[PDB]
Amino acid sequence: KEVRKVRIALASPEKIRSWSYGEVEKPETINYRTLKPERDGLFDERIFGPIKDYECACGKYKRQRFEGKVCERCGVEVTKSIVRRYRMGHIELATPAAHIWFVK
Amino acid sequence: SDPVRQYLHEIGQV
Amino acid sequence: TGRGLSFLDLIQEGNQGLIRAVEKFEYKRRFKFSTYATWWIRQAINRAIADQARTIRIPVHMVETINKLSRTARQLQQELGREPTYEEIAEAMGPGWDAKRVEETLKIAQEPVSLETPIGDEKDSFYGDFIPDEHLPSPVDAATQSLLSEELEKALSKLSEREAMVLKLRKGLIDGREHTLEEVGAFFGVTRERIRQIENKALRKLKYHESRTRKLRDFLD
Amino acid sequence: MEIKRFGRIREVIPLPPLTEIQVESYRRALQADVPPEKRENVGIQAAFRETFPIEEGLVLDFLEYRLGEPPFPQDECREKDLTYQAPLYARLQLIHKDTGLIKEDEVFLGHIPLMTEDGSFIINGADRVIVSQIHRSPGVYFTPDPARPGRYIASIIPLPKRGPWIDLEVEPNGVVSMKVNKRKFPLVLLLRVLGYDQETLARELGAYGELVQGLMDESVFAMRPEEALIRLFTLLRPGDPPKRDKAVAYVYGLIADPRRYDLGEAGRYKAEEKLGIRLSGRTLARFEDGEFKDEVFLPTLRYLFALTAGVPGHEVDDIDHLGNRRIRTVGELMTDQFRVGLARLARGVRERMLMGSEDSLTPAKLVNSRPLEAAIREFFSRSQLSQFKDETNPLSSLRHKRRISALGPGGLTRERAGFDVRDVHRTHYGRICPVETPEGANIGLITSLAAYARVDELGFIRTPYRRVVGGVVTDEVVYMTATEEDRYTIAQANTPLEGNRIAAERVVARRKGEPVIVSPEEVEFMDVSPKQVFSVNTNLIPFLEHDDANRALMGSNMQTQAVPLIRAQAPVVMTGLEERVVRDSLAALYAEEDGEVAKVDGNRIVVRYEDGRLVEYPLRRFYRSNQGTALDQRPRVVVGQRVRKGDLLADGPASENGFLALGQNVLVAIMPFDGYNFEDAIVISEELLKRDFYTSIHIERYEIEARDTKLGPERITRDIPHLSEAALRDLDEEGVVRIGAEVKPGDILVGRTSFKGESEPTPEERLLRSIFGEKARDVKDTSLRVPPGEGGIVVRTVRLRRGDPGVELKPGVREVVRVYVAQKRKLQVGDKLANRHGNKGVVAKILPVEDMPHLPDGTPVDVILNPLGVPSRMNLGQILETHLGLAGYFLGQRYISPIFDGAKEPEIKELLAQAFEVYFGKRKGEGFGVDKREVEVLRRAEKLGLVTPGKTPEEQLKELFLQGKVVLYDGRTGEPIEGPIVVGQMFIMKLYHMVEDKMHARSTGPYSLITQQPLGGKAQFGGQRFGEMEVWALEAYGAAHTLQEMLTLKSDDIEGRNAAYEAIIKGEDVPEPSVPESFRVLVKELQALALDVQTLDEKDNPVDIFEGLASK
Amino acid sequence: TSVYIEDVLHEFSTIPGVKEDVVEIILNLKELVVRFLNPSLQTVTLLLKAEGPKEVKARDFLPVADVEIMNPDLHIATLEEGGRLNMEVRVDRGVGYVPAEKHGI
Amino acid sequence: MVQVDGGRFATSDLNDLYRRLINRNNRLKKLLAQGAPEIIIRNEKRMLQEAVDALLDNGRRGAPVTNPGSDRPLRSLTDILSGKQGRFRQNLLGKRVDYSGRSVIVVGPQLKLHQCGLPKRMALELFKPFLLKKMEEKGIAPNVKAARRMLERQRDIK
DNA sequence: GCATCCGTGAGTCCAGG
DNA sequence: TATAATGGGAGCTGTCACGGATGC
Ligand SMILES: [Mg+2]
Ligand SMILES: [Zn+2]
């Protein structure tokens, strides 16, 4: 279909979580020894998506034959790594926080 | 306005 | 302060220290509270500094090893009048430590740097603006894979559809995975010796067509 | 050839040492040649004395410091990317108050960078220059209130980051307010804190009508000094416990604490002068015998009220006066940063004093050098004022060292700067040059040191003036500040002098910058020179008097930008400076004492002096500059030559027998030419290239690292996969290109192979491997190749390795290989030429010699400049330079025309006359009459009123020549130019901006990480930005598909761009583009901002531009 | 059209014992005038071997038949005690102006 | 988080901002579970607000966040979106573009009004896919990729 | 009704370093 | 893990001009 309008509106927490592919629980980037993403951190392939196309984190699934398959051992869906540019996460806050834009 | 001055005040309460 | 963490972050870690100390304090020992609390407060602040101050997180024992290596080199330089080599540090550090290990420990301690660190006085210049993207393929790369796929099809079609199919299965250009001889033979209804043999002759006919037309050499890099 | 010089002005003094603003400042700051007990409290000495002693308990005190010797000499630092720097030791002693135990040692702080002989530095192996800084001097200033016309703002200013700027204003309600740290409170309160009872303030400010009454607040004198102090502290720190000792601590650290608050030595002197008082210290108040004692506040209040009532003897202060604007030289900038590092070191000292064994503490354990080191390192690496040195040519460096930025830390930001900042004040006369500056954003901010100018001890720029008593011009020469010279009638250096007496009856002089005619009885001083009014670059322009300022500026600046030519020439018209500049820039090698020459060679010059000793000078030969220009020296004497002190032993870059050779003297015709010199373009003779004029050498540095990896070592090898000996022809067994091979774009300089990342061979790859029967090798070619449009002849290879002696690289790298590749650059179409008068332009056409306008005797001109530039640009100096150039061409001599004291048209005409006789009597003797074409042109020039009619052809041709015109014959036709044409010798320079360095073009290249748009820049094989305004262009055209191609297929659009390149190499039409990746990034960056951004069709039902990859 | 010097790898060198840099020496050698007495002759490789304290000029070339140096006084180099020089220059017929960057001889 | 050539890591400021956020959120959740006093939970709550503030518009309210050892504010989401360098006017009203070049202009008076002088070199790269196609059409090369190989080096060009 | 304080904006492209 | 220790430190100084929301 053809794009004809672009809409902008507030996101509900329900909607945010609907975008999110996984909560980022840990403030870890990548492991200082392997230079690979840390589980439940900011780059977790378990949330955002594989780093190599059609190959899962642990390596059980490297081919395109598995698609939408989530590895049982490491939990990373096997698709194209382009998804790491498109998949939202979320951080679920303890106390609610205002959004400075609608304050200041 | 300065969070650490505010917290030094709340602490000097007790 | 000035150790990776905000004043207020540091106070809230000291507050977790105060909490451990309240729940563990024994008045019966007759000691004032401050004395026992100060231990758990220092403990808490140091565990936080060692646990958060690094973007790329490094285990507590390793951070302590890195810091020991820091202070060693600083002693060595403050007595040498100059910086130490890897070898001087591997000596003053002790046994088990060779220059190579000093080197690798430093390479592990190397903190990341900001993509928004400017290069020029003007704001036109960031550091990210010089880093290419080596992941997404180039149009040259993709086009080359396209020309490879098409020329592979062109040379596969000179084979009969059985031998083309045996090879397209035994390598995995279809469905993405390569098969065993038993699978190709239980699909074609033929022995594993026979399917291996028609794979042999398919490869041999492809080698002859390639000695003749030379249409695929340019893609071997 | 003879060098004949004009002028009558007898400049008493020479130009002072032209890098002393650098060298003398750093010498002052370090005092590394002073026995320590003789050091004065200045520089890093005073930084120590500030930071120490250090208390709390324990006490750590400073004894003395010392600088050692460099662990590597200047050239070795340059080679191994090290810093030129002396080790800094300081001796301290720990003292326990109670115990009395003293532990004393020499703690090693790190290294201080040392300044090379020419006033520069070597940081990380590159040369760099600390540019001086200009800012408002400390002190007290009264500037009028812009809103309230009869009221004035008093302002108290310290050094930068040595206290806060304080304001006092007479308010609309009558009470005097003081602002500090942006808090407005009544000054009355601080006056009480100082001990002032209404007694003293009444008897001191009663003279004023009612101004003291607004200072009368009875509720302030009702309380004691302690109560007023806690009142002030609660005013200044809302929400802080008003403890008495805490308020004394804070207000002392605000006003009276010399460690924290510091007017300059200059701020102090200027306060004493302005306020009619004395200061014991560089603070505003003191702490004495337990209380606060005033120094400054009552005087400042007194002056402010006196200026507000209107008593005589009080003025506002001009804040762009150079008597109230001062220079911070290199020593002061570096010492400032040193004080900062020291302060951090002292915070580390007190931290280590509280905690840790109170018995076994040495200085070694108490001092952490690191803070200090990183402060100094940082100032010399990333400060705004630590500029990469300009070594284009020697004048570039010499002018760099004498710049003055108003910007930099603690001065101004861009667009924090107004007009009055950039105006040339009246007080720039003799100090700051009014032409040399940037044209563009930084105009008025980066400026240049006048030549006779020098920076006095307190930071003000001073100019020389000769004392004239009773119209007798003595040789006593006096260097003044602005505020000093503002009190003297100062005549110009052109006023006529029959010996030592002023000969005129009426004299041109200055009273406070204003020009005035005046008797020799009224003259007090007289200018030293005209050279005194301009920077060095502007003093290199002859005939400057005939040049509009606007183009004198570009002449000045482009002189900075002249490539050293292999065959450089001192101009035929010089100014009296071209030798001093070679001498002070330290490019050329000289003779230290009288002596005879022992040995002369392409690499060395050995000299036996009158001492008998043999001194060998090595010559810098084909070394590479900051900007890739070749900096080498050449021997100018031969074996056995007796040479006196200061004689020339070697010519450096752009130096001809000791003269400043920034270009060539070529033969010039000023006439249009078929459009090839349209709009300042330029046309040259192919014989320029024949005889190797405008030909430079440039050496580019290429570098590569081989580092360790988690997948294996990157190693430097000749063994590179999938390559032929055709490819590895000129690579040695190590993999390094041999010295002396020609390298063209695509040539491998250093053969590097890296282990392939873990690759899953896509099925196609497995099948192709099986067809050919060759294992996929384990490494991949990553060799350093030659970039697009570069290359040359290899003249060096430096290979540093880890595991080799003296060599240790940054962690992880195994080896570094530098390849130095040089190239002799001829002059090509697109290279930029310029003259010293503003005339600049690009070479547009190289005609062969048979097409050039030529002279009657067959001599072809060298460059054909278009007269259409001259009128618009009002820079007639080049015309005169061409005339005198003609005269000197035939007479075969050079001239020296001082600026404003140069050669005048009558004398140029005498010379032209002599030259015509040489030109034409040659012809009459050789047996040739006046050619027919000279007749036609003569009749033309007669109708042009250019000759007197009836005179003979020789009479008339002489007449023309004297106007600097000659007959010219179109080389294509044989026919003469319809008329006579100016022809002369001119100084033309090759500017650095050569087309070889700018031609760039990409089909496709690397992209960005977040945006997936192409990188910018030639070096990155970038794309050209297509800014907003270009989109506006393509819009006003309605080239919609062209626009959409810019916005998708050629950037951001990933599927579309890959499909486009395929379609092209295939022969198909380019595909309809799709959504550009940067709009996806905008989508997602607004999600992160908790904003739903929804693409809808006309059915208001969503459209998934992420094709499922974002929905679960 | 070409110069080979002994122990010189490329144009931006300096020979020890010689005042002139190679660049300058090629600037001198350009100005050499070499007359071919025979019209069949196309190309000549002049040899020059010289040393010691001596200002090598164009006469010092080992002469060839059908070849004459029309400016023998042309200065070339200034050699020092122990300084040597061993050139082989190649001189061709031709038309007009053919830059080094083109003829690549 | 990208490994640049030298092996060292570049990263974005949004990473340090998010990390600040997760640390203050996790510390808050743990001070809640352990039943911490009021004053402390108030301080954690305030600091958490300010961490969310800095991530979304750093420096908007009060102080701006910085990385240790630098006075340079961090690039928040707002500074990415808004500004002369912000995404809008930096990558969506104008972009860098493939198939472009640049060099020095010279007057060509022999051109017709509809003409320009374009060097061979700029022209061979600016038209490079076309050049490979037509190089394949005539005999100059077997296929696209062999043509690109042949133009890779200068001396190979015929 | 006026000052008053707030935030927001302030030309393009190109090179280096 | 146990003497006792109990409220931080910078700030940063020379734009200019609007519009539009907030106090006597
Ligand atoms: Mg050891
Ligand atoms: Zn897996």
Cα–Cα distance for residue pair E62/D100, rounded to 1 Å: 91
Give the end-to-end CA distance of chain F in Å, rounded to a whole number: 44
Nearest to D653, CA basis, from D561, D559, D730, D566: D566
- Token pair for residue D112? 């201080």
Contact C140, F148 (CB under 8 A): yes
Residue of D nearest to A68 (CA): D1112
CA distance B13 to chain F (A): 10
Please tell me the distance from the alpha carbon of residue F43 to that of residue C11, in angstroms, as a whole number: 10
Residue D1051 lies in a domain: no
Same domain? D792 vs D646: no
Q: How many domains in chain D?
A: 6
CATH architecture observed for domain F119-158: Orthogonal Bundle (1.10)
Q: For D540-564, give the DSSP string.
A: T-TTGGGB-HHHHHHHHHHHTTBPP
For E14, what's the count of Cα atoms within 13 Å in the CB-facing half-sphere? 23
Report d(CA D997, CA F102) in Å as an integer: 11
* SS3 (DSSP) at D462: strand
Contact F49, F61 (CB under 8 A): no
Distance, in Å, from the CA atom of D276 to the CA atom of D272, rounded to the nearest integer, reads 6
Please give the structure tokens belonging to residue F20. Answer: 């600040």
Could you tell me the sign of the dihedral formed by the alpha carbons of E35, E38, E42, E46, in that order? negative
Distance CA D327, CA D450 (A): 13
* The residue type at D949: P
Q: Tokens standing for C20?
A: 């451990």
Instruction: Look up the CATH number of the domain holding residue D728.
Output: 2.40.50.150
How many CB atoms lie under 10 A from the CB of residue D8?
9
Question: Are D230 and D248 within 8 A, CB to CB?
Answer: no
Using CA coordinates, name the residue in chain F closest to C108. Answer: F8
Q: If you write DSSP's letter for every residue of E18-78 in order, what string do you get?
A: BSSBHHHHHHHHHT--EEES-SS--EEEEEEEEESSB--BGGGS---TTEEES-TT-B---
Q: Are D298 and D141 in contact (CB under 8 A)?
A: no
Nearest to C140 by CA among F6, F139, F151: F151
Neighbours, chain F (3 or more CB pairs < 8 A): A, B, C, D
Cα atoms in the 13 Å half-sphere on the side-chain side of F143: 16
CATH number at residue D924: 2.40.270.10
Which ligand is closest to the CA of C96, given by its number?
A: 1
User: CA–C1' distance D256–H12 (Å)?
Assistant: 18
Q: Does D183 contact strand H, using a CB cutoff of 7 Å?
A: no
Distance CA D746, CA D730 (A): 13
Give nearest nucleotide to B2 (CA–C1'): H8
3-class DSSP assignment, residue D399: helix
List chain F residues with CB under 8 Å of C140: 148
* C-alpha radius of gyration, chain C, whole number: 33
Nearest to C55 among F2, F19, F74 (CB): F19
Which amino acid, D334?
Answer: M
CA D631/CA D696 separation, integer angstroms = 11
b/e burial code for range D787-815 (CB count within 10 A of at least 16 → b): ebbbbbbbbebebbebeeeeebbebbbbb
Question: Which residues lie closer than 8 Å to C121 by C-beta, 6 or more apart?
Answer: D384
Q: What is the dihedral of CA D172, D173, D175, D180, to 10 degrees?
A: -50
- Helix extents (H) in chain F: 13-33, 38-57, 77-81, 87, 120-126, 128-137, 144-152
SS3 state at D300 = helix
Helices and strands counted in chain F (H then E): 7, 4
Was domain C58-111 assigned CATH 3.10.150.10?
A: no
Give the whole-angstrom CA distance, residue D948 versus residue D943. Answer: 10
Provide the CA D400 distance to its chain's centre, in angstroms.
5
D607 vs D588: CA distance, rounded Å: 16
Cβ under 8 Å to C: F residues 64-103: 67-68, 72, 74-75, 85
Would the CB atoms of C144 and F36 count as touching at under 8 Å?
no
Phi, psi of C32 (to 5 degrees): -55, 160
Which ligand does the CA of A66 lie closest to? Answer: 2
The position carrying tokens 């840390």 is: A38
Chain C hits for D1008, Cβ within 8 Å: 128-129, 131-133
Residues across chain A: 104
**Which pair of structure tokens corresponds to residue F115?**
């003409």
CATH T-level fold of C137-217: Arc Repressor Mutant, subunit A (1.10.10)
Q: Evaluate whether chains C and A are touching (3 or more beta carbon pairs less than 8 Å apart).
A: yes
**C-alpha span between D705 and D913 (Å, rounded):** 66
Asked if D554 and D632 count as a contact pair (C-beta separation under 8 A), the reply is no
Q: Looking at beta carbons, which pairs linking D857-860 to residues 24 or more positions away fall under 8 Å?
A: D857/D923, D859/D667, D860/D667, D860/D685, D860/D687, D860/D971
Domain limit, last residue, from D799, D826, D853: D826
Pairing of strands F2-3, F9-11: antiparallel
Indicate the DSSP class of residue D787: P
Residues D59 and D185 in one domain: no
Give the type of residue at D625. Answer: S
Interface partners of A (3+ CB pairs, < 8 Å)? C, D, F
Q: Which of residues 237-266 of D touch strand H (CB under 7 A)?
A: 237, 239-241, 250, 253-254, 260
| Separation of alpha carbons F108 and D677, rounded Å | 10
Q: Does residue C70 sit in helix, strand or coil? A: helix
- Nearest ligand by distance to the CA of C72: 1
* CB-strand contact D1016/G, under 7 Å: yes
- Cβ(D1090)–Cβ(A11) under 8 Å? yes
- Contact of D241 with chain B, judged by CB distance below 8 Å, is answered with yes
Residue D604, phi-psi category: left (phi > 0), alpha (psi -120 to 50), beta (remainder): beta
CA of D438 to C1' of H17 (A): 27
Give the Cα-Cα-Cα angle D12, D16, D22 (nearest 5 degrees).
170
Q: Distance (Å) from CA D295 to C1' H6?
A: 39
Cβ atoms < 10 Å from Cβ of E7 = 9
Sign of the alpha-carbon dihedral angle for D923, D927, D933, D935: positive
Residues tagged in the binding site annotation of C for Mg(2+): 90, 94, 97, 121, 124, 215, 218
In chain C, residues with a C-beta closer than 8 Å to the C-beta of A29 are 55-57, 112
Encode burial over D317-355: b for 16+ CB neighbours within 10 A, e otherwise. Answer: bbebbbbbbbbbbbbbbbbbbbbbbbbbbbbbbeebbee
Chain H nucleotides reached by a protein CB under 7 Å: 1-16
Are both D474 and D443 inside the same structural domain?
no
H or E element at residue C139: helix C139-156
What is the rounded CA–CA span in Å between residue D1009 and residue D105? 54
Cα distance between residue F7 and residue D708, in whole Å: 9
What is the number of the ligand closest to the CA of A50? Answer: 2
Instruction: Give the C-alpha separation, D948 to D965, whole Å.
Output: 15
Which among C126, F63, F127 is positioned nearest to D1010, based on CA atoms?
A: C126
3-state secondary structure of F3: strand
Q: Is the CB of D382 under 7 A from strand G?
A: no
The total of other beta-carbon atoms located within 10 Å of residue D860's CB is 21
* D736 and D614 share one domain: no
Instruction: Judge whether D1012 is closer than 8 Å to chain C, CB to CB.
Output: yes
Q: How far is F108 from chain D (nearest CA, A)?
A: 7
Give dist(CA D733, CA D742) in Å, integer.
18
Residue C88 to residue C102: CA distance in whole angstroms: 10
Tokens of D220: 């302030």
Measure in Å the smallest separation between the Cα of D239 and chain B Cα atoms: 7
Q: Are D181 and D236 in contact (CB under 8 A)?
A: yes
What would the 3-class secondary structure string for D55-71 be?
ECCEEEEEEEEEECCCC
Indicate if D429 and D573 belong to the same structural domain.
yes
Spatial distance between the Cα atoms of D934 and D915, rounded to a whole number of angstroms: 18
Q: Could you list the residue range(s) of the whole structural domain that residue D642 is in?
A: 588-652
| Residue in D494, D528, D524 with CA at minimum distance from that of residue D508 | D494
Please indicate whether, in this complex, the C-beta atoms of C82 and D722 are within 8 angstroms of each other.
no
Is the C-beta atom of C125 closer than 7 angstroms to strand G? yes
Convert A23-38 to b/e letters by CB count within 10 Å (16 or more is b): ebbbbbbbebeeeebb
Instruction: Give CA angle at A6 (A4, A7), nearest 5°.
Output: 135
Question: What is the interface size between A and C, counted as CB pairs within 8 Å?
Answer: 25
| Amino acid at the residue D129 | V
Instruction: Phi first, then psi: give them for residue F11, nearest 5 degrees.
Output: -155, 170
Residue type present at position A70: V
Between the alpha carbon of residue D689 and those of residues D572, D828, D848, the distances in Å are 21, 9, 10
- Best probe of the D interface among F107, F149, F150, by most D CBs < 10 A, is F107
Q: Do C207 and D768 touch (CB under 8 A)?
A: no
Residue pair A78/A56 in contact by the 8 Å Cβ criterion: yes
**Residue D997 DSSP label:** G
Round to whole Å and give the CA distance between C195 and C190.
6
- D1028: the nucleotide nearest its CA (via C1') is G12
Q: Which amino acid, residue D682?
A: I
Distance, CA of D319 to CA of D314 (rounded, Å): 15
Evaluate whether D913 touches D921 at the Cβ level (below 8 Å): no
Task: Find the Å distance, CA of residue D512 to C1' of nucleotide H13.
Answer: 30
Do the Cβ atoms of A93 and F52 come within 8 Å?
yes
F70: tokens are: 């630098």
Q: Quote helix, strand, coil % in chain A, to nearest 5.
A: 15, 10, 75
Backbone angles phi, psi at D753, to 5 degrees: -120, 135
C7: closest CA of chain B, how far (Å): 8
Assigned domain for D831 exists: yes
Angle at D1085 between CA D1081 and CA D1087, to 5 degrees: 120
**Closest-CA distance of chain E to residue D844, Å:** 19
Calculate the angstrom distance between C1' of G10 and CA of C117.
Answer: 24
Distance from C-alpha of C220 to C-alpha of D829, rounded to nearest angstrom? 42
Say if D1037 falls within a structural domain: no
Note the CA–C1' distance, D388 to G17, in angstroms: 8
Which DSSP state fits D255? I
Find the helix packing angle between D763-772 and C192-213, rounded to 10°: 80
Closest C-alpha to D74, from D129, D22, D118, D19: D118
Same domain, D256 and D336: no
Peptide bond preceding B3: is omega within 30 degrees of 0, i.e. cis? no
Sign of the CA dihedral D16, D22, D24, D25?
Answer: positive
F62 touches strand G (CB under 7 A): no
Q: Which helix (H) or strand (E) holds D750?
A: strand D748-750
How far is residue A18's CA from residue A22's CA, in Å, rounded to a whole number?
10
Same domain? D580 vs D594: no
- All residues of chain B having their beta carbon less than 8 Å from the beta carbon of residue C7 are 4
Distance D560 CA to H24 C1' (A): 62
Looking at chain C, which residue has its C-alpha nearest residue D441?
Answer: C122
Which nucleotide in the DNA or RNA is closest to residue C118, CA to C1'? G17
Domains along the sequence of chain E with CATH: 1-105 (2.170.120.12)
Query: Which residue in D263, D88, F97 sits closest to C82, CA to CA?
Result: D88
Query: Residue D1022 gets which letter from DSSP?
Result: -
Residue of F nearest to A100 (CA): F53
- Reference D343, options D305, D372, D300, D315; nearest CA is D372
The one-letter amino acid code at D603 reads N
Residue type, D742: E
In this complex, do D1095 and A99 lie within 8 Å of one another by their Cβ atoms?
no
